[PDB]
RNA sequence: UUUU
């Protein structure tokens, strides 16, 4: 039924037509508090204590990432953890190597055997293989991986959210909207975070990521494989970008325009592109617009170019070969677009 | 297809 709009779910409708204050009165203070709590040090220490003996004579470092750490989490959020065993931080594996899978396999029995951890799932077939486990002393669910890129984009999001808090409020709202619309199986919280970032770049409220990664005498790249993962941490004052105070009216107006924008976006020809950060970035052109390391990387890993023959293209701003929405279907996109359209209408005054 |  491509000729009928998919009706916005009632659970979402009640939240939209409900006051914007109710959305945040509790959620923003909680999310900001959860960026740093002492439980995370316990988890870190316990994870090192656990795994060290299993990898003697190898450096071991734990890096926390994901929605808790960036400031859009809630009490039921997982904590994402990158375990770096043997200085793997700067190694990129689009799909895990057999050596990486072997390390993850060896880690599994440690969580099983420890009374401090409940093994929930062992997912070795994923693009980013993970161990899902509950840290029992704190009750916090942890996703443990061997891939540094999530930590890298977390540090970027943190800089963005701290410099321009409107971004953080918007991501908390749209995260909740996605859950109430039952879209999470297709569109992740991370995907819509990038969409918020791109929308605000178009409003001159956030920099293009590429502009933060100019390579010259004063700035060199931190490379994870071919990807530039660092960025200049300049004040927005120096970048020439205004910094807004989030108020309920300001937030509501930006959300209305956000949903209006993605309701009318031409997903057939354009991609959401926070790297470039400019309007109307063509799917047909993006691959020729990236740094020379991208072309070299694909030339030597030809099945690892960005997947552009997909209904919806949202490019990760650091892992430039990753369309984070590659799993969205034609009907999933129609659903999202229809929900955006109806949400924009309900936010009008 | 499963982290971000």
DSSP A96-144: --HHHHHHHHHHHHHHHH-TTEEEEEEE-SSSS-EEEEEETTTTEEEEE
Alpha helices in chain A (DSSP H): 10-17, 20-24, 27-33, 38-51, 67-70, 98-113, 149-163, 166-180, 189-202, 236-239, 248-264, 292-300, 330-346
Residue A112 contacts residue A96 (beta carbons within 8 Å): no
Is A266 known as a binding-site position?
no
Per-residue b/e over A314-324, b at no fewer than 16 CB within 10 Å? bbbbbbbbbbb
d(CA A342, CA A347) in angstroms, rounded, equals 9
The DSSP call for residue A81 is E
d(CA A223, CA A292): 13
Half-sphere exposure in the Cβ direction for A323 (13 Å, CA): 21
**Two structure tokens written together for A16:** 């939209």
Under 8 Å CB-to-CB from A15, ≥6 apart: which residues?
A: A23, A176, A177, A180
How many Å does it take to go from CA A1 to C1' B4? 34
Q: Using CA atoms, how far apart are residues A302 and A317, in angstroms rounded to an integer?
A: 20
- Chain B bases closer than 7 angstroms to a protein Cβ: 1-4
> CA torsion sign, A154 to A157 to A163 to A167?
negative
Identify the residue whose tokens are 């090192």.
A48
Q: What is the resolution of this structure in A?
A: 1.8
Q: Please check whether residue A225 is in contact with residue A92, taking contact to mean a CB–CB distance below 8 angstroms.
A: yes
Residue A143 marked ligand-binding: no
| Nucleotide nearest to A153 in CA–C1' terms | B4
Is the C-beta atom of A304 closer than 7 angstroms to strand B? no
Number of domains into which chain A is organized: 1
Distance CA A116, CA A50 (A): 9
The structure tokens listed for A240 are 């020439």
Place of tokens 């220490």: A45
Let me know: does A201 contact A277? Beta carbons within 8 Å: yes
Answer for the pair A338, A264: CB distance below 8 angstroms, yes or no: no
Interaxial angle between packed helices A166-180 and A248-264, expressed in degrees from 0 to 180 and rounded to the nearest 10:
60
A95, closest nucleotide (Cα–C1'): B3
Q: A20, A251 in Cβ contact below 8 A?
A: yes
CA-CA distance, A69 to A156, in Å (whole number)?
11
- Closest alpha carbon to A186 in A12, A2, A326: A326
Q: Pick out the nucleotide with least CA–C1' distance to A125.
A: B2
Task: Report the C-alpha gap between A146 and A62 in whole angstroms.
Answer: 10
A149 CA – B4 C1', rounded, Å: 7
d(CA A219, CA A88): 23
Cα(A155)–Cα(A65) distance, rounded to whole angstroms?
8
Residue A260 CB closer than 7 angstroms to strand B? no
- B2 C1': nearest CA residue: A126
Structure tokens given for A287: 């691959």
Q: Which technique was the structure solved with, according to the deposited record?
A: X-ray
Provide the domain limits for residue A347. 1-349
Closest nucleotide to A66, Cα to C1':
B4
Tokens of A221: 């790249």
* Phi then psi dihedrals of residue A280, to 5 deg: 55, 60
Contact between A159 and A172 under an 8 Å Cβ cutoff? The reply is no
């Amino acid at each position: 039924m491509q000729h009928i709009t998919v009706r916005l779910p009632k659970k979402a409708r009640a939240m939209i037509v409900g006051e914007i204050t109710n959305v945040f009165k509790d959620k923003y203070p909680i999310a900001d508090k959860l960026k740093v709590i002492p439980e995370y040090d316990v988890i870190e220490q316990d994870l090192c204590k656990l795994l060290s003996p299993g990898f003697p004579k190898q450096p071991l470092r734990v890096y926390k990432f994901g929605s808790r750490i960036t400031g859009i989490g809630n009490r039921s959020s997982d904590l994402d953890l990158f375990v770096d065993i043997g200085n793997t931080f700067h190694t990129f594996e689009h799909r895990a190597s057999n050596a990486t899978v072997a390390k993850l396999r060896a880690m599994r029995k440690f969580f099983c055997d420890s009374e401090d951890w409940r093994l929930i799932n062992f997912i070795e077939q994923a693009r980013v293989p993970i161990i899902k486990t509950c840290h029992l002393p704190t009750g916090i669910e942890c996703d443990i991986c061997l891939n540094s890129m999530g930590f890298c984009n977390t540090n970027l999001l943190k800089y963005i959210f701290e410099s321009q808090p409107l971004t953080q409020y918007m991501c908390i709202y749209v995260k909740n909207w996605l859950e109430r619309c039952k879209l999470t199986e297709q569109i992740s919280t991370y995907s819509i975070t990038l969409m918020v970032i791109y929308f605000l770049q178009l409003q001159a409220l956030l920099p293009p990521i590429a502009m933060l990664q100019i390579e010259d005498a004063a700035n060199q790249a931190v490379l994870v494989g071919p990807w530039v993962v660092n960025f200049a941490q300049k004040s927005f004052s120096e970048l020439g970008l205004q910094q807004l105070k989030a108020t309920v009216p300001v937030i509501k107006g930006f959300l209305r325009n956000f949903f209006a924008y993605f309701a009318k976006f031409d997903y057939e020809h354009f991609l959401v592109c926070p790297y470039i950060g400019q309007a109307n970035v063509e799917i047909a052109k993006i691959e020729r617009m990236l740094h020379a390391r991208y072309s070299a990387y694909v030339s030597d890993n030809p099945e690892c170019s960005i997947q552009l023959k997909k209904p919806m293209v949202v490019q990760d701003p650091i892992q430039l070969n990753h369309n984070v929405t590659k799993a969205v279907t034609k009907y999933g996109l129609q659903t999202f677009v229809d929900y955006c359209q109806q949400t924009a209408e309900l936010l009008e005054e």
